[PDB]
Subunit: 115 residues, 3 copies
């Protein structure tokens, strides 16, 4: 029932409008913040294009008590020209917990929904 889609340091996103929405989840500084604890399916798609040739696209759990981010779902990819990266998966999130998208070195998005 809680859910969020969000559209194109951690990455940053539009949280309204049109396709962007928050619904039972907060936001601050690129991150989805969880209010109701449970299992969420979290996902992110990132469009890439260019001209280690190796890009990493990840979802990370941040907890304010701790600096260090914990990896959740992570993809590595090498490559006139376009590549798209998608990650999805289910994670147990407690109230408080935040999730961000990072990509190391419009079309893209970031989202979740409780399952």
């Amino acid at each position: 029932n809680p859910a969020a889609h969000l559209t194109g340091g951690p990455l940053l996103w539009e949280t309204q409008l049109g396709l962007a929405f928050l619904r039972g989840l907060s936001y601050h500084d690129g991150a989805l913040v969880v209010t109701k604890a449970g299992y969420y399916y979290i996902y992110s798609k990132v469009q890439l294009g260019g001209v280690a040739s190796t890009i990493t696209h990840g979802l990370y759990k941040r907890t304010p008590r701790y600096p260090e981010e914990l990896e959740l779902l992570v993809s590595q990819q090498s490559p006139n020209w376009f590549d798209s990266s998608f990650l999805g998966g289910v994670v147990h999130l407690e109230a408080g917990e935040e999730v961000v998208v990072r990509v190391l070195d419009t079309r893209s998005y970031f989202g979740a929904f409780m399952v």
Copy 2:
């Protein structure tokens, strides 16, 4: 309740809106309809939608498109540039009204290709 998984059928330009199997094998429709390539919503609300397209400048586009207004609103799209094979997957939660339709297109226009949705 509402959910569907549709699997690739033999189309068919224009873009074009891919056509789908709704009943044989793994395909099914449960609380959603289908009309000429389109999943059609019946119960308003937030749906996770997805499509996977098996591909087989030289640049392919894969997208999920809403109809309501006139015209087609891009919902989710990827570009890629691949004896070759590649696969393109898109998913995400979008709000849909009873009456809205969702379709799939790929440029330079599949059996391991599919299209589906469920209410979230």
Copy 3:
């Protein structure tokens, strides 16, 4: 509990075994909730529609099929559910599959990769919808 599971960290079954990828089921981000696990398979307890998914992290040195397959009683052959063919000096590539399938009590789903090489980089999960 709405049945669900997330399994992590693929590795291959014993060479010559014929078996599928094996996964971590308890530690870290891995859990099983209202599904069971047996030698690589998620085993369905409660019949219905599930969104099943798997991501596999690929990479080598110089065609790969990543699939989710169903095992059903008295059917010697694994049935395809969702499959992807990809074809990529070191390289890296990731393959994601997701989709809603109907599964009966007693049915099993496994993940395979052809050919297998190949925590957070590889995974296999599901939830009832």
